[PDB]
Amino acid sequence: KKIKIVNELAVGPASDVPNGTGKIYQFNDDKVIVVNHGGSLTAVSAICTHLGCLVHWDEAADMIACPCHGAKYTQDGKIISGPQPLPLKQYKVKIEDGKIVVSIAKLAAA
Amino acid sequence: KKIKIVNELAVGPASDVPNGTGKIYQFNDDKVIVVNHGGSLTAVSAICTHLGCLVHWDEAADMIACPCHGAKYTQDGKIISGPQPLPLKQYKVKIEDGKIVVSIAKLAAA
Ligand code: FES
Ligand code: FES
């Protein structure tokens, strides 16, 4: 009673993103930042929804920071502060065979 | 004894790029990073020559850094280290009427 289409990609070894760090990967047309912090491995779009620069993980401040107009986001992409209109799109992410597997789903009813 | 074609664009107010900072601008088909550091206002292509992520200025480290795979460049776009094949193409930049004017030339001899 629902159709959904999932894109799925093993982007790199789990050892790429050890604790306290974040790394940017290509996901087809988007760029995703995968973050490993506080026991939690998350994945969100790395492109600011304001005007489209790349973000990075700031471990000391426990935040994602955008270098262009000062946007600050949570590890999960939620808005902390800045001019950005939207949160960064949330991905799913898992470790499989020692690999970081990122995925996103788009739904549709039958 | 030389003819050249110059693209020129007043990209924003000079107040946009104070000392110790760098800013990204659309320059027709390229994107340029203008950096103000050490009394020197420079402008180079913002597109990393490895795989094309947008770069940013790192004032603390005195370098242009690409967030994807670690490319480092000097303020003038020269390669410091990383997987990139090429330096960032250099633009010329000056202040007029409190505005940042970026320009680049393509040659023709006669
Ligand atoms: S493009 Fe990220 S703050 Fe504007
Ligand atoms: S895109 Fe800059 S290091 Fe690869």
Curated annotation (Swiss-Prot), chains A, B:
Catalyses which reaction(s): 2 oxidized [plastocyanin] + a plastoquinol + 2 H(+)(in) = 2 reduced [plastocyanin] + a plastoquinone + 4 H(+)(out)
Domain called Rieske: residue spans: 9-102
CC cofactor: [2Fe-2S] cluster
Keywords: 2Fe-2S, Cell inner membrane, Cell membrane, Disulfide bond, Electron transport, Iron, Iron-sulfur, Membrane, Metal-binding, Translocase, Transmembrane, Transmembrane helix, Transport
Subcellular location: Cell inner membrane
Cofactor note: Binds 1 [2Fe-2S] cluster per subunit.
Key word Lipid biosynthesis present: no
Molecular function, one GO term: metal ion binding
Membrane-crossing residue ranges in chain numbering: 38-58
Protein purpose: Component of the green S-bacteria bc-complex which consists of the Rieske protein and cytochrome b subunit and which appears to lack a cytochrome c1-equivalent. This complex has a comparatively low redox potential.
Additional comment: The Rieske protein is a high potential 2Fe-2S protein.
Protein name, as recorded: Cytochrome b6-f complex iron-sulfur subunit
